[PDB]
Structures are given as structure tokens and as C-alpha cells.
């Protein structure tokens, strides 16, 4: 969702 945070 945000780069590699929270999935993509």
C-alpha cells in the first residue's frame, strides 16, 4: 500500500 508497508 505504501512502498513495502502494509503489503504494497
Residue numbers in the entry: 1 to 8
From the article:
We first tested the ability of our design pipeline to control both macrocycle structure and membrane permeability on 6–8 residue macrocycles spanning a diversity of structures and N-methylation patterns. For 6, 7, and 8 residue macrocycles, we selected 8, 5, and 19 designs (representing 6, 5, and 16 clusters), respectively, with fully satisfied backbone NH groups and funnel-like energy landscapes and spanning a diversity of sequences, structures, N-methylation patterns, and structural motifs (see Data S1 and S2 for sequences and design models). Selected macrocycles were chemically synthesized and purified using reverse-phase high-performance liquid chromatography (RP-HPLC). In some cases, two peaks were observed with the expected MW; in such cases we experimentally tested the two peaks separately and refer to these as p1 and p2 in the design names. To evaluate the accuracy of the design method, we determined X-ray crystal structures for two 7 residue designs and fifteen 8 residue designs. The structures for two 7 residue and twelve of the 8 residue macrocycles were very close to the computational design models (backbone atom RMSD < 1.2 Å). Having found that the macrocycles fold as designed, we next investigated their membrane permeabilities using transwell permeability assays. Eight 6-mers, five 7-mers, and sixteen 8-mers had apparent permeabilities (Papp) greater than 1 × 10−7 cm/s. Of these, eight 6-mers, five 7-mers, and ten 8-mers had Papp greater than 1 × 10−6 cm/s. In our 6–8 residue permeable designs, the number of N-methylated amino acids ranges between 0 and 3.
